[PDB]
Design an enzyme around this catalytic site. Sequence first.
Site, mmCIF file in Angstrom:
data_model
loop_
_atom_site.group_PDB
_atom_site.id
_atom_site.type_symbol
_atom_site.label_atom_id
_atom_site.label_comp_id
_atom_site.label_asym_id
_atom_site.label_seq_id
_atom_site.Cartn_x
_atom_site.Cartn_y
_atom_site.Cartn_z
ATOM 1 C CD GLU A 144 19.619 32.528 36.719
ATOM 2 O OE1 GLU A 144 20.617 33.206 36.362
ATOM 3 O OE2 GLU A 144 18.626 33.011 37.283
ATOM 4 C CG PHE A 156 11.873 37.627 43.541
ATOM 5 C CD1 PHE A 156 10.986 36.827 42.832
ATOM 6 C CD2 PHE A 156 13.058 38.017 42.922
ATOM 7 C CE1 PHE A 156 11.274 36.420 41.527
ATOM 8 C CE2 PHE A 156 13.352 37.617 41.614
ATOM 9 C CZ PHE A 156 12.463 36.812 40.924
ATOM 10 C CD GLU A 196 20.223 38.398 36.541
ATOM 11 O OE1 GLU A 196 20.490 38.318 37.762
ATOM 12 O OE2 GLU A 196 19.070 38.266 36.075
ATOM 13 C CG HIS A 247 20.218 42.488 37.680
ATOM 14 N ND1 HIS A 247 19.621 41.278 37.968
ATOM 15 C CD2 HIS A 247 19.494 43.032 36.672
ATOM 16 C CE1 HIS A 247 18.577 41.103 37.176
ATOM 17 N NE2 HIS A 247 18.479 42.154 36.380
HETATM 18 C C1 2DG Z 1 18.322 34.692 37.502
HETATM 19 C C2 2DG Z 1 19.425 35.275 38.376
HETATM 20 C C3 2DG Z 1 19.248 34.794 39.809
HETATM 21 O O1 2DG Z 1 20.269 35.349 40.642
HETATM 22 C C4 2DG Z 1 17.853 35.139 40.320
HETATM 23 O O2 2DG Z 1 17.672 36.561 40.324
HETATM 24 C C5 2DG Z 1 16.807 34.475 39.421
HETATM 25 C C6 2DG Z 1 15.383 34.899 39.777
HETATM 26 O O3 2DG Z 1 15.088 34.617 41.151
HETATM 27 O O4 2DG Z 1 17.018 34.847 38.051
HETATM 28 MG MG MG Z 2 20.276 39.531 39.439
HETATM 29 NA NA NA Z 3 15.301 35.467 43.398
#
Ligand code: 2DG
Ligand code: MG
Ligand code: NA
Lengths: 1018, 210
Positions: free
Chosen positions: A532, A596, A456, A413
């Site tokens: 997601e 987060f 990602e 990512h």
């Molecule tokens: C999609 C990917 C997951 O790992 C998280 O980062 C989520 C947000 O909390 O988004």
């Molecule tokens: Mg990510």
């Molecule tokens: Na997260």
Amino acid sequence: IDPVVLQRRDWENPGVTQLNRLAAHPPFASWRNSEEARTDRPSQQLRSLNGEWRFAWFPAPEAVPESWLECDLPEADTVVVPSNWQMHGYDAPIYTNVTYPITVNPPFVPTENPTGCYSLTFNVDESWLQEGQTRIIFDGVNSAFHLWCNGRWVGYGQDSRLPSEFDLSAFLRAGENRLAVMVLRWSDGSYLEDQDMWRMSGIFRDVSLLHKPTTQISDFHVATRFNDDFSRAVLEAEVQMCGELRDYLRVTVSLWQGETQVASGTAPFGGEIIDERGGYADRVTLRLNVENPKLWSAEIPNLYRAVVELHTADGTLIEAEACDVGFREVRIENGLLLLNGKPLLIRGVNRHEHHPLHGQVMDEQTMVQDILLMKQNNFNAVRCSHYPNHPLWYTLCDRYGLYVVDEANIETHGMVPMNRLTDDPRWLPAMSERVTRMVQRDRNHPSVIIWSLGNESGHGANHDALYRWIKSVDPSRPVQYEGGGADTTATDIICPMYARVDEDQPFPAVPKWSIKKWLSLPGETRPLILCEYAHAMGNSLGGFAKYWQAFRQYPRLQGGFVWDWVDQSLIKYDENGNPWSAYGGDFGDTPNDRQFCMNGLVFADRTPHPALTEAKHQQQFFQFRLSGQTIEVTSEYLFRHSDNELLHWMVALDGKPLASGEVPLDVAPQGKQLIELPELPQPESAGQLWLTVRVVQPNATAWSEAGHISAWQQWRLAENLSVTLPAASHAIPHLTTSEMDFCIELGNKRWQFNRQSGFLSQMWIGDKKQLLTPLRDQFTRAPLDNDIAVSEATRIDPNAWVERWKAAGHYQAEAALLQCTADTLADAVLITTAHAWQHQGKTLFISRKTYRIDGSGQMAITVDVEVASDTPHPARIGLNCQLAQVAERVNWLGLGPQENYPDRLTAACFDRWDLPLSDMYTPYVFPSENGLRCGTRELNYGPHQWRGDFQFNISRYSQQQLMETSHRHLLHAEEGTWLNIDGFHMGIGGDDSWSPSVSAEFQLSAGRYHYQLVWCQK
Amino acid sequence: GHYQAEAALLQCTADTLADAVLITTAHAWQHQGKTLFISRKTYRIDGSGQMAITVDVEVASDTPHPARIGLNCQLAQVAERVNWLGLGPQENYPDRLTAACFDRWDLPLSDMYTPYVFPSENGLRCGTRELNYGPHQWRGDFQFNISRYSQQQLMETSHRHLLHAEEGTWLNIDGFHMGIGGDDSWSPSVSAEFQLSAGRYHYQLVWCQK
Ligand SMILES: *[C@@H]1C[C@@H](O)[C@@H](O)[C@@H](CO)O1
Ligand SMILES: [Mg+2]
Ligand code: NA
Ligand SMILES: [Mg+2]
Ligand SMILES: [Mg+2]
Ligand code: NA
Ligand code: NA
Ligand code: NA
Ligand code: NA
């Protein structure tokens, strides 16, 4: 320690992901008894090395002393393995979302590289060494390691999430042996491990020893192929061996249905001709015919047992391996994902391997607890975000019944752009191993229905190559991948994250189309399943019902995986040893991304968030329609009849039950049932009649207890409006006028309106004061995680609701009095007030009120609010005060019993609810506005009763404290009880939690608002 | 029984304030023992000559959602012009008002009636904050129509040429009005968001002289 090991620096070379590692394969146990293989009992040839190990921490691999290879370091501690060393306090766990926890300089890692030196002294029996092969299996080592046995170097491994296996046969001796494992926190493998989760390290999954004979089953693949109506199947088992080929060698594959043998076949080794050089002499494929197989689904997880026996022709067993077999077909046809010929509706959730005490170590108890809670809340599917899971997970999903997305451990990512590595052919080798060894391990699990290429990592040419590799080796499962825009050439399924239902998000290059729109883009034919969606961060899941309405209406919208199952909070202890939930930055970890990591439907200890019930209700397997007195029940099951279901119904008049009954449910999959309710007695009282139905499971299952409620639904029936006038009151209230106050007296009751502020500042019942803080308008809420809208600590979206509120002065504005007057009526006192809220010479809101106190001791508060059209829409339009009272119970007639908000209230039921005060507060780890209940007509607390049509929350915590506190354990009960009563409250949103996500119909945009409350004593 | 419902008085009181007279009323509309709607009002007449009418309406949840929630009267005055601050200049309804603009509009009275060949409710203008007709001014946030034809006459007449101007001017002022629909004309076609389903409704009008 030296020399080649330190000089070669294999952990900074993506061309070296292993040294001397054995081939990947499905789970082995090397049974030497067939019946033990059949029944899946412990094998003597598979030993756990889990338990107490020796451990020492070092700041870098250069700091590791040579003597450690030969013998125990006196300074080492004895620790439990598996474990993450951060959970034992040796260094900090780090929470970062996108930005790598290390300087981005591939393939290099920091010179200061925390190094975990694990060692174990253990016994090996001579029997294990006289013959055959003894290997060691590391199921999970984060992130890379070198291995020594008795001082001799064995090998090296990368990929934290798949097993690394090494042949120790030439290294061991009978009696005492010592293992030395040097685990590096960071490696070139870390560039492929940038998942939005705690960054930890160590030997965090099982360690085991496996003994196999020299002549051995080295691999086997099980496939099940079907005729058109699934009444006939062929089980095909390809078996591979290692060791010396002999003509007398045989493979038998048997298929078992409990104790019944359904099929068996035997062949010598030697595959069919495949090319000009012949075929595989070391392989054989067995084909077994099965008539009317019992089919595997999440609904009914029918399993068979396949046993693979390697043996001699005379009947002497060499070894047996085995697996559970689920007869199911997965395919995409005419744009629909089908399971056994029927289109799936994915009620899914993403699930990380997280435990608040043990970090990233997974145990059976926690796994089982998760699965039970998922199934009880109407989930049928799980995505392994974002790595292959602990091997037991798949076994449990096979047996309990959940559809699994198995995902390769590849996330990059933090690269700029995201595909910098995945489009680089130099990184194709490291990537391929993360995909190929996953498939080799998990391909026999029926619960795995879809492969995922990772998460990602943009879209790069390396994805296309590996997409095709899987399609070639395993045509039995679709392949999906979201990166580079969710609909690339590397995915069979349109699988976006947080694409909204109706609203487009037209990002350059990687837009998130409305899911309904996405399906019909010119030339598009694929199914859409969100990888997601409905980001469950704190007070969230606003608009969850919008997704489910769309999933049901559109055939090619086949559901999604909620993000996510469980908060990634960790337990810390204060000075008194009291536990508290911690997030990013709480370990001195920096930079970090704060809260987060907590996006779960359940707290870390698996206590449900209020959002879980909304998920359960929307993911119900029975749909209901009411017409007259007829309930129509529709089954959304694809395979099972409702053979463990009865429907309870109840009619109530404003919470007072009037009639109830029960009818057994007998609905075929996809079928309908009509239930005619008996003639209902007419009520001799004004009010609204409410019908509630619920589906109850009378019998216990593997995943639920007797009496489990799986579905519910409510309707308004007849309403009889009240036309009878209340009797003219005997008493008449009196108005006393001082300079500072308008006072109202009725018996021993007193109302005091401060004439400077224009608010009701005090009430007395005899000598007891009722208020600690005056009753005042309130237009703000303590910001939810959604209002805050931050996914990376150093990134602010000026369009975020909190940002607009702060900038407009919503949290700053103070009441200015425009009018405060008093009048005496025939039987009442009328107080009229007008206020204005201003910031920088700008009127934000105008509140106009009347208070009418009559002879019955009721205070009628009429409120009319103006909101300036150019100010951002307010969080709420209501009143608040601090009550002097602290009562044990809260009783209300409205939506409940759990917390519900305007865009998250479909699961809530209208009825009379009575809860302890503490249940009226939701302990989100990051504190915010919480505990609201909507659609409320009557509220009772201590001596007080409020009536109207309002939303309320009630707790010992002010909005001010909630918005000033970062952690729930830091909150302190204030004096008395804070009451927030709202005419109107804004949606909570949640489509994502890093941009405005509250749909327009849930924003307080009308400009003019009206509500009325009656306050009296009960 | 919406067209047959009879207003039954529940309350009518008068009060004298410091600078105003306050009339309070409650009515129930019933059809054959069933209460369809309740209307609760205050009329506040102050020293400046303005009458503030506050209206709160309950609608039974099990009666079909009503076409409108408002007030009507026949004015004695017949004037030449209609002047308003709201959406216009042409006829507009809640589900058909995107083309209309908020501004000061001034039309001949005849322009406030749409001569549909089959007569019906017609000539509504929405989002109106001020309405002027002869000596009268109404202020608030309402929808209105104004013409020489009663709802009763429009309802009873099959052809526009058979309509006759009634004495004075019929004013229909609504706090709320149902959408007109039209996705088709042979089944219910008014979308849910334009139906009057909220159960409880509030609106205020100020009536004064200009
Ligand atoms: C999609 C990917 C997951 O790992 C998280 O980062 C989520 C947000 O909390 O988004
Ligand atoms: Mg990510
Ligand atoms: Na997260
Ligand atoms: Mg390497
Ligand atoms: Mg509902
Ligand atoms: Na669908
Ligand atoms: Na049943
Ligand atoms: Na807070
Ligand atoms: Na007509």
